[PDB]
Every structure is written in structure tokens, then in C-alpha cells.
Amino acid sequence: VPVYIYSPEYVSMCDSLAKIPKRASMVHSLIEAYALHKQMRIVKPKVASMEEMATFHTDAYLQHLQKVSQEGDDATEGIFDYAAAIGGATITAAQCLIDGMCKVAINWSGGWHHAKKDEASGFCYLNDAVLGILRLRRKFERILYVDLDLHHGDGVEDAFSFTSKVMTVSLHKFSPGFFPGTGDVSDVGLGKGRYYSVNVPIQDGIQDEKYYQICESVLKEVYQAFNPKAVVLQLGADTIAGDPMCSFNMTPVGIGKCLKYILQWQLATLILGGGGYNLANTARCWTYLTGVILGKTLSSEIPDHEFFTAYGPDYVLEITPSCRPDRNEPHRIQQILNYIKGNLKHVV
Amino acid sequence: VPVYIYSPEYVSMCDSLAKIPKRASMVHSLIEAYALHKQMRIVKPKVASMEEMATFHTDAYLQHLQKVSQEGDDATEGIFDYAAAIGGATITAAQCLIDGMCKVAINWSGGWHHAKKDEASGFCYLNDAVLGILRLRRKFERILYVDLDLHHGDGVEDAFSFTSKVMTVSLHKFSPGFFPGTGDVSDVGLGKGRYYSVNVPIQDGIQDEKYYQICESVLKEVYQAFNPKAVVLQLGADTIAGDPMCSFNMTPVGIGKCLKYILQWQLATLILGGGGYNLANTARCWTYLTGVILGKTLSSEIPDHEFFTAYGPDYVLEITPSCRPDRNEPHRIQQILNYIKGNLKHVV
């Protein structure tokens, strides 16, 4: 059955740093509230060690990061303790997969895909996704990373754009001035890790229907033109309607079919989170996806949990798309899918 | 000359509160660097007292904020202090105007237009703009509040919904899911003040010419129809191209014109800053604008000051639009321009 990397101390840990909200708690609180945890194997995460974070980051960086982590912004205090934890969490998820414990491991507080080996970007100071991928390598030769967060999962792409052992697929918003700004379809990787990096530029207003069509064909091509052995899926919920981001118009269900599509492969999957700046909703989303993984249909009545009052004013689990246009012209998308399939003709 | 509300103590204040990043020193540091300050009157703000704040907020509210602000995130500590300091700063600006000390009073760290009398909203705890409006109402009768920050300045509209003594005009983005969510053009005030609340809902990618041209038409009709005596202008720099918000595609010049226009009126104007989450960008903007207020032209190159590295790699004060389309279907805009001009018939 799935593994849920959870421990009170970890949740409380992912609700700290000067500019952090209590999203870890709300997410757990609901998964707990619908009793989904009861259907999972809970594992308590470890705190990664400098030596482990260092598998991907430069000693120099970790040492500095740490140094500052106590001082604050003289970057706040905690970041290193914080990072160490989530990092540890992801690695624990990978370890369980590797140790044929589960075929699905979950770390919803992970997904910090904007960090580099020697640099922090997009409030990510550790690339817990790379650390897990690396960890999967020990038994899995080919790893596939799918990023469904609204932003480009550069950190990870970048981390591996020189090998063909790790393939990444990032569906993100791509518009001049939108962060990070990287990820156009022509960005296929470098040297030997060329054509093993996929990016699908989408625009605002895509809904469940078109988003999945793109998800599925792309994944379809990939799977057979890369034949992976393990998957790292990051599901940042900034594509879900409601979110400050106000860019895509998705609901947990769309993302849920994209999730089912992967799960069916029957491969070792590491499930991460990432953005989701509409607390209640992000919690609605990963709690929904956690149901998908369990094969349980969830009630639409938000239980009476410590954070109930925040699921106003309808207090139900479904999310309704905002009344916003799709600026996605259906043929441009076809131009991209085509391109990609071409790029894939170079993957062996 | 114009007044610049600066205080070492005020900038240190405004550059901290746990998740408050150093935007205040950046803006001063650059205005200071271009030596604009030398041509203004630097006035030290006062802090606001419970009573000054109470002018607009409920003692209950004021005291809750007060309490928490001591504890911290047990919302950090300071919030009350921060609020009362920034409030104090607008109050001072307005008194200067009232005393006919100057014609323009600047407080780039104010413009927290989302706060309610008894509720914080959109990161705003105190509504330092209202308090300044309420301070102008001692001497002035008809106050006009123009809000050119990406968002609807609802807290200040609400505050004056039933009075025809204050007219609020807000140009902002209005789209299903975009915060705060209010501001349609059909939100014209209530009872005694119906038609005294003006809202201009725009879409993404508007640039300097379309934007200005709209601004100018509403302000012309508003000026002739409401005939103001003092102005309160909020210039949140989140419309500028670059900015995380990736919504409008403006440069300080399109906003510089709106400001210049308002200034042609020769009325006591209070300038407030506001959103602007691209620090170097915001500083550039408000430095350009302060130069507008002074009527001076600035070096395209950035002087060398404490936050110099931060303005690279082309170290200049201009900003270039982004390659994103404008979604303001021309015909729809006019519809607004007309509903408004018709609404402005019933104003005395």
C-alpha cells in the first residue's frame, strides 16, 4: 500500500520559517480527517545529512546555507534545518521504493524543484527531487520525472541535462516574464542529456480536458521512447483554480487522471507536492489525489477537522473552475506535441 | 518642495516583519543615490496612536492586532507597530498638505488599500490610506483617491461607500479568481455615495498607451464632475513589466503620465506606493516618479549605491515591456468608459 512520510514533528517543521504558513498541517489534517492515513503505511522521515544533501549540492553551498540558517537575513533562520528535513523525507520515500516496500511513496511537503547544486532559486534551497532521483538510481537505471506544478521544474531538468539516464517532463506556464522563464519546447537538454528533457509550454486558462490530453499523449510518447523503471511526480497545486497564481483552471480531478495514467504503469513512484498557495484548496487537492492512489471515492462534505472553517463558503471538496478563458489555441499545442514527438525520435 | 517622509527608524521598520523583504531601503537608497531627496523636504513621520488608528479601525481590532504583534506567530510580531508606523507616516504626509507646507507629500511605504476597519486583508492590517484621507477631511471636503496598483483598493472603497465627500477611482485587473475579486464597473458606491466609487476593470498585457488613455478619460470626467480639493494617489508598482504578478505590461512612463496629469491640477496630492514585488523594478519606478514630481530627467544608468549589483546586468532605470499579448478587446473597454461617464452624470 502507499507510504506516507509523516511525523508530527515533520508537519510542525513544514509550518515554520519566517514566511511559511501552516499548509503542512492543513494538508495532513484533511487526509487524516477523511481517515485516508488509515489506509497507508506511515513512515517517519529522517533528516538528510550534509553528506546526502551533498550528493547533489556543493559542500560549499550547504556549508554557507547552514551558516546563514542560524543567523537569518543579515534567507531567514531555519532554512537549513527545514531543507534537511524535507530532503530527508524525499530520500526516505525513495529508500522505501528501493526497498520494495511500496510502489508508491508520498511526501506532499516536497517538490522544491527550483534549487540547483550550488544555488537556491524560487525559495527552494535544496532540490529534494534530485536527491530522491539520485537515490532511485541505486536500483533504477532510468528515472522519469513529471512535473505538473504550474512552473518550470528547471532545477531538476538542469540537474540532469547531460545524461539520458534521467528524463524530465515539465508542463508549466510559459509566458514572457513568468517565472522562471525557462522551459520553451526547444529546451531539450545538452550534450548526451539532449532530447531527454521535455517541456510543454501551456498558457492561462487550460482546464482539465485539454490539460490531460496534452499530459497523456506526451507521457505516452515518453514511456515507450524512454522505458523508465521509476517515476518522480511533483504535483504542485498552483494550476488549480482559486490559487493566487490565477493561471490555470484545473481541479484535482484533471490532475487525478494524469496521476492514474502514471500509476497504471505499475512503476515505483515517488509523489511530491510543490506550490499550492490556496491552503484549503491545496489540501483539497492532495487529499483528493491521496484518494485516487487508495482507490477510495471521497465524500464531498469536508469533515469537522481543526481547519474546517477555511473550506468556506460551500464547505465541500470539489473545486469549480473560475470563469476565465483558455488562451490555448488547439493547433499551437499540436505544433508542440509534434515537436516533442520529433525530439523523442532521438531518444534511445 | 515635495515632502519625503523618511526616517532611519521608519526604513528599518518597513524592511523587516519576518516575511517583509528589504524593498524600503532599495527605494530610498536609489532616490538618495540619484540625489532626489536633496530637492524635497525630508520630514520625519510620527507613529500613529491608538486613537489616530481608531479614526478608522475598531478598538477591538486595534487591540487584537496589538496583542498578537507582541506574541508573534503563536502574522508575526511588530505587525501592530509596523501598521501604526506606516499609518503614522501617511498621517504626517497629510498633515503637511493640510498645513499648506507643500502640495505633494510622499510615503512610498503606504498604500495598504485592502485593510478593513476590523479585518486585515491582502497582507494589509491597518488601512493607512483611509487614515490619510480622513486626515484631509479636516480642511478639504471632496477628496479623490486614485489607485493604480494592479489590485482593487477595496478597503478604501468600502470605507467610503456611503459618503459623497470621497470618491475612489481604481484601475485594476478584474478576472474570476484574481484577488480581491471585487471592482466590477457595476460597483458604484452605496446610498448617499452611489456613483461616488469608480472602478475600471482591465485585463492582462495592457501597456503604457492603452492604460494612460483610459486613466486620462476617467480622471477628466471625474475631475470635472466631482471637482476635488485634495488627492490621495496610490501607485503600487505591480503593473510594471517584469513583476512576479506577470499581469500588466507597464513601465514607469505610462504611470508617470497619469501622475503628471493629476499634478497638472495643482491640488494637494499625497503619494502612496503599494505593491511591487520586483524590488529593483519598484525602486526604479518610484525613483522615476519622484523625478516626475520634481520634473527632472534621470540618468539612464543607475548611479552606484548600496544595492547596485541588484540592478544588473544592464544597470539602467528603464524597463522594457514583455512579449505577452494585451487582452483588452477594444470594444469592451469603451463599454466601461461609457457606463462610467453615464454614472458620472448623477454626481454633484
Ligand SMILES: Cc1ccc(C(=O)Nc2cc(C(=O)N(C)C)cc(-c3ccc(C(=O)NO)cc3)c2)cc1
Ligand atoms: C504579496 C506578494 C505576493 C506575491 C509575491 C510573489 O509573487 N513573489 C514571488 C516572486 C518571484 C520572483 O519573481 N522571484 C525571482 C523570486 C517568484 C515567486 C515564485 C512563485 C511561485 C513559485 C513556484 O511555484 N515554485 O515552483 C516560485 C517562485 C514569487 C510576493 C509578494
Ligand SMILES: Cc1ccc(C(=O)Nc2cc(C(=O)N(C)C)cc(-c3ccc(C(=O)NO)cc3)c2)cc1
Ligand atoms: C510563493 C508565494 C507566492 C505568492 C503568494 C501569494 O500570492 N499570496 C497571496 C495570497 C492572497 C490570498 O489569496 N489571500 C486570501 C491572502 C493574496 C495575495 C495578494 C497579492 C497581491 C496583493 C497586492 O498586490 N495588493 O495591492 C495583495 C495580496 C497574495 C504566496 C506564496
Ligand code: NA
Ligand atoms: Na503543470
Ligand code: NA
Ligand atoms: Na487599482
Ligand SMILES: [Zn+2]
Ligand atoms: Zn509553482
Ligand SMILES: [Zn+2]
Ligand atoms: Zn497590488
